[PDB]
Design an enzyme around this catalytic site. Structure first.
Site, PDB file in Angstrom:
ATOM      1  N   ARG A 169       0.804  -1.212   0.000  1.00  0.00           N
ATOM      2  CA  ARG A 169       0.000   0.000   0.000  1.00  0.00           C
ATOM      3  C   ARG A 169       0.837   1.261   0.000  1.00  0.00           C
ATOM      4  O   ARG A 169       0.361   2.304  -0.460  1.00  0.00           O
ATOM      5  CB  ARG A 169      -0.945   0.037   1.205  1.00  0.00           C
ATOM      6  CG  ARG A 169      -1.902  -1.135   1.316  1.00  0.00           C
ATOM      7  CD  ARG A 169      -2.488  -1.586  -0.013  1.00  0.00           C
ATOM      8  NE  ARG A 169      -3.613  -2.490   0.180  1.00  0.00           N
ATOM      9  CZ  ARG A 169      -4.219  -3.150  -0.801  1.00  0.00           C
ATOM     10  NH1 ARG A 169      -3.808  -3.006  -2.053  1.00  0.00           N
ATOM     11  NH2 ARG A 169      -5.236  -3.954  -0.526  1.00  0.00           N
ATOM     12  N   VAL A 170       2.063   1.189   0.499  1.00  0.00           N
ATOM     13  CA  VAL A 170       2.943   2.344   0.458  1.00  0.00           C
ATOM     14  C   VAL A 170       3.506   2.522  -0.944  1.00  0.00           C
ATOM     15  O   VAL A 170       3.643   3.647  -1.432  1.00  0.00           O
ATOM     16  CB  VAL A 170       4.040   2.180   1.525  1.00  0.00           C
ATOM     17  CG1 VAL A 170       4.795   3.458   1.731  1.00  0.00           C
ATOM     18  CG2 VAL A 170       3.406   1.754   2.819  1.00  0.00           C
TER      19      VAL A 170
END
Lengths: 177, 140, 277, 104, 105, 104, 140, 52
Positions: free
Chosen positions: B7-8
């Protein structure tokens, strides 16, 4: 006179408008037989297809050249291009001849259809061959069946069917070849 | 695919790959749903068989062989050729052969535009729909 | 908590042997009942070429018979023809037709009441207990001449092979109530035949469609009983898979607890020893 | 599991073991009844794996008879105690040794 | 097992050969080294194994290699303790293994 | 093990309702839209009590399971059951008349 | 039987017993897969039941008294009678009395021949095959 | 549970091919020839690939 154009084909496109679309059409008993009634052919000369059937057996489905059927008017024989016939049969002996060999099945009664294409469809319930019938206990029950005469018309009908069955069975165990 | 998370790194990736892989994660999310619903083959819906034929298409696109990493502009086009049409002809088997058929036969000047601009411009979206129709697919 | 996970491996291991026993119990019952299905397929078709096949008729009264199983590890067989019942019981519904819904098999009365209960009248069950005979299928048929419909609808599963079971609608029309009306084409297609009965054509066809009812009923609950054993065979092989995948996740869970309880009981021994030494 | 079924005294009939259960100690008419009761109660436990799943219709009435025989044997091991009159609510029973062998 | 290495290492490093080694029951090498850790007063690791199981096993297995002189190839019989491949004695052993030959009845 | 075919239809209504309320308990977050893409829904307390009571009484057994997945309130289950229904018809018709031809 | 093993194996077995217990352990190995299916009596297979009924002829054969050790020639005569097929006659609930119909009725001359020769010779395989038919098994 | 002659001609073509591969993985050993009679056979790598 025929305001309901039914059939397996017409049932398909009507069922696609009322049923859910996820289901394929149900099958029909027409899709499991290729031998029809008005399908012209199915004789080729002297030997015609004889489908002698039973609920628990298929006793013959190959061709014969003459079938002696025990109708309620009397014994008749079916040749190749016989007239279309729905024949109700008495208890009697269906004789299958294809030539020099001849098998004799004694049947209990049940119809025999000759279709316009020449296929014979004998349809009886119990079709025992004459090798496995006994000539002893048939009169042991026939003399019993010629005794119990009640006023009850339901049993009077079953005793009438008891009489004419063993009467034709004894008459076809006396005169064997 | 269902358990792997980043997700980063998401919303930090290639902009052209971000257009074509949003549907790739989508068509793989449905592919795991309808393979869980059909654990055996007796029931065939033919609207989920589209998903079983597109999901098995995209799985064969994503598998690659060892010690040959692919640049991101040649990797965006191969998923562009698979999440969209251009590979429904090939059954499931020659898709690895079709991917190298897509990458080699398409003009290598379209890989420079995708690399330098970063994303699939509509000027390049039209040209790459056009160059993906003149690819000799091995499944015929 | 290491015995609760060990008594579950007791459960799934015998379920995985129960459901593999029933896989081949239903597989040997699928083949010794196949020697009775293709024998019984003979008597069906001379009536389907004498009387045709007319499913989509607008009869005044109908009797629909969905014949199901008695035992219920079939795997959605008794429900697939239950949805095929109302798919048939709404297509032929065209003018406000009186319908009597009949279920053969104990799994039919529990599922047809959920779908269509007010036009449901009869429930035949316990029919596959010993075997299926024509005299039994005649008595089941003779209870359907107690009501006098113009058509009969028979919903069953045609046993094609061990894999595919397509549902079937076999239609039997009442003798001159509607059956000769549907043969009437510029004359009749029934007038080709010379009747060789004692009495008229109107009451030889009365004898002949009860015989057409009893034959197709005998075939239906014989094709369905062999379609039952071949769907239980595919259901009891999908539940040995499911009781071997559950058993595999439960042995991995047990080996993890076996390893963790040897480490826990060992740390309890070293701590009690380090407190003294 | 014997106590939750209501059978009291909740003696496990299989797991209870004595050294007086040799045939040359208690005779053969006591050893074969005890070895016969243990056989019917063990067969029922191997059937109860399939009864609780299916329901006692496919045992071909040899194994259906040993289910009903063991269920009678299970309750016949239960007995009202003279000290559990305040608990069970029934007067206690003292069963002689000959009446146990004759009954089972 | 280190005495078996040293005989195989002479054929590798001096004779220059492709040596076979048979460490029959590599689990019993682990099991014996786990006993000498317990007798030396060392705190046991997960599942009662020695804390040095990875390095007592890896110290054996890293001498079985190919050099520029020759090679040592070892066929090691592997016992799995509780039919449990996730037990730390086969799981540490399987990190070193380059092939498995399963003999079946 | 046995699948849903062996359930009673009183129990099939349980499994159908419980799969619906299991999906309806999930919702998109306004902090999770940066990696999921779905915008986040703040659902008022009166809309969760109203929404889950309808699935318990049976007012929404018409809709499928995935209409309840990742939606705000019960207005949006009906908004999503149409979008799911609408796209079971529309799957094609992107053949010609594009922005993708040669000169434009 | 499935868990009890001997790593020495049958190289230290009595010969003559080795001739007939090598197929005893095979007929019991097939029975153990067919075991826990014996509660299906009405649901029978005509091949699965033959290894099911013979496998129960042999587990009731190996039953023994608390302190009655049997000499080895009387064990291999008794397991000859159950493996070769002489006790398919006997019902499964009285096999443990059928070996005392076999040992006490077969004449003791064949036991000292089997003990001294230490194997079932074909000269002796003809004799006690005939002696095993003149025994009074509990059959009905 | 279905039968040996039941399944398709392609599926039984694999059964005929696998059974003569499952047999072909056997090999007589040179150290075993003092008690088995049959001589041992060292099989080269190229003769194994081309043989299979």
């Amino acid at each position: 006179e025929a305001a309901a154009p039914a059939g397996p084909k017409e049932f398909t496109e009507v069922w696609n408008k009322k049923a859910p679309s996820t289901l394929i059409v149900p099958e029909f008993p027409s899709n499991y037989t290729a031998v029809k009634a008005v399908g012209e052919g199915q004789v080729h000369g002297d030997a015609f297809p004889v489908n002698f059937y039973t609920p628990h057996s298929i006793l013959s489905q190959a061709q014969k050249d003459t079938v002696v059927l025990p109708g309620v008017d009397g014994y008749f024989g079916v040749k190749a291009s016989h007239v279309p016939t729905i024949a109700q049969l008495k208890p009697g002996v269906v004789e299958l001849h294809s030539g020099a060999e001849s098998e004799k099945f004694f049947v209990s009664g049940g119809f025999a259809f000759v279709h316009p294409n020449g296929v014979t469809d004998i349809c009886v319930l119990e079709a025992a061959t004459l090798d496995q019938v006994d000539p002893a206990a048939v009169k042991s029950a026939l003399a019993a069946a010629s005794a119990a005469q009640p006023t009850d018309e339901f049993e009077q009908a079953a005793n009438r069917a008891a009489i004419e069955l063993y009467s034709a069975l004894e008459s076809a165990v006396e005169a064997k070849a | 695919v269902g358990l792997s998370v980043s997700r980063v790194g998401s919303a930090a990736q290639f902009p052209g790959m971000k257009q074509v892989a949003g549907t790739l994660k989508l068509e793989l999310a449905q592919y795991r749903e309808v393979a869980a619903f059909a654990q055996f083959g007796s029931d065939l819906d033919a609207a989920t068989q589209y998903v079983l034929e597109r999901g098995a298409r995209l799985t064969e696109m994503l598998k690659q062989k060892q010690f040959a990493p692919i640049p991101i502009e040649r990797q965006t086009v191969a998923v562009y050729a698979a999440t969209k049409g251009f590979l429904d002809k090939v059954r499931v088997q020659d898709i690895v052969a079709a991917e190298e058929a897509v990458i080699s036969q398409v003009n290598p000047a379209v890989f420079k535009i995708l690399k330098a601009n970063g994303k699939i411009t509509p000027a390049l979206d039209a040209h790459l729909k056009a160059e993906l129709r003149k690819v000799k697919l091995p499944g015929a | 908590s290491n015995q609760a996970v060990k008594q579950r491996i007791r459960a799934i291991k015998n379920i995985g042997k129960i459901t593999k026993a029933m896989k081949m119990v239903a597989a040997s019952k699928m083949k010794n009942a196949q020697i009775a299905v293709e024998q019984s397929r003979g008597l069906v078709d001379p009536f389907v070429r004498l009387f045709g096949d007319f499913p989509a008729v607008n009869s005044n009264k109908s009797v629909v018979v969905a014949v199901t199983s008695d035992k219920g590890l079939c795997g959605g067989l008794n429900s697939n023809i239950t949805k095929y019942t109302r798919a048939t019981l709404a297509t032929t519904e065209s003018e406000g037709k009186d319908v009597v819904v009949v279920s053969i098999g104990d799994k039919g009365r529990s599922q047809l009441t959920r779908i269509e209960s007010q036009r449901y009248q009869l429930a035949i069950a316990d029919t596959y207990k010993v075997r299926v005979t024509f005299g039994q299928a005649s008595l089941i048929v003779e209870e359907l001449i107690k009501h006098n419909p113009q058509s009969y609808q028979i919903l069953f599963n045609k046993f094609r092979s061990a894999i595919s079971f397509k549902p079937t609608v076999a239609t039997i029309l009442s003798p001159d109530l509607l059956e000769k009306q549907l043969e009437d084409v510029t004359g009749n297609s029934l007038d080709a035949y010379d009747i060789e009965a004692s009495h008229e054509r109107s009451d030889v066809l009365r004898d002949l469609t009860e015989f057409h009812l009893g034959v197709t009923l005998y075939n239906a609950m014989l094709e369905n009983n062999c379609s039952e054993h071949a769907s239980r065979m595919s259901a009891m092989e999908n539940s040995t898979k499911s009781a071997g995948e559950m058993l595999g996740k439960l042995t991995l869970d047990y080996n993890r607890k076996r390893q963790a309880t040897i480490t826990t009981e060992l740390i309890e021994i070293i701590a009690g020893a380090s407190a003294l030494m | 599991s014997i106590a939750e079924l209501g059978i009291y005294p909740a003696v496990d009939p299989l797991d209870s073991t004595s050294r007086m259960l040799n045939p040359n100690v208690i005779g053969a008419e006591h050893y074969n009844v005890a070895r016969g009761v243990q056989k019917v109660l063990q067969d029922y436990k191997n059937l109860q794996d399939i009864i609780a799943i299916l329901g006692m219709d496919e045992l071909s009435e040899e194994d259906k008879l040993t289910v009903a025989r063991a269920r009678k044997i299970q309750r016949f091991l239960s007995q009202p105690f003279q000290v559990a009159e305040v608990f069970t609510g029934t007067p206690g029973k003292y069963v002689d040794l000959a009446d146990t062998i004759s009954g089972f | 097992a280190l005495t078996g290495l040293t005989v195989a290492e002479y054929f590798r490093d001096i004779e220059g050969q492709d040596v076979l080694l048979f460490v029959d029951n590599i689990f019993r090498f682990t099991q014996a080294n786990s006993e000498v850790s317990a007798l030396l007063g060392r705190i046991p690791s997960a599942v009662g194994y020695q804390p040095t199981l990875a390095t007592d096993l890896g110290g054996l297995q890293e001498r079985i290699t190919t050099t520029t002189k020759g090679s040592i190839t070892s066929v090691q019989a592997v016992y799995v303790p509780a039919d449990d491949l996730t037990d730390p004695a086969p799981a540490t052993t399987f990190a070193h293994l380059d092939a498995t030959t399963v003999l079946s009845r | 093990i046995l699948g849903m075919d062996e359930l009673s239809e009183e129990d099939k209504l349980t499994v159908a309702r419980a799969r619906k309320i299991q999906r309806f308990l999930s919702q998109p977050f306004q902090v999770a839209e940066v990696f999921t893409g779905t915008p986040g829904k703040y659902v008022d307390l009166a809309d969760t009590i109203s929404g889950f009571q309808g699935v318990l009484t049976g007012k929404y057994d018409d809709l499928p399971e995935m209409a309840f997945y990742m939606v705000g309130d019960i207005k949006e289950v009906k908004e999503k059951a149409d979008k799911m229904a609408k796209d079971i018809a529309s799957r094609k018709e992107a053949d010609n008349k594009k922005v993708s031809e040669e000169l434009k």
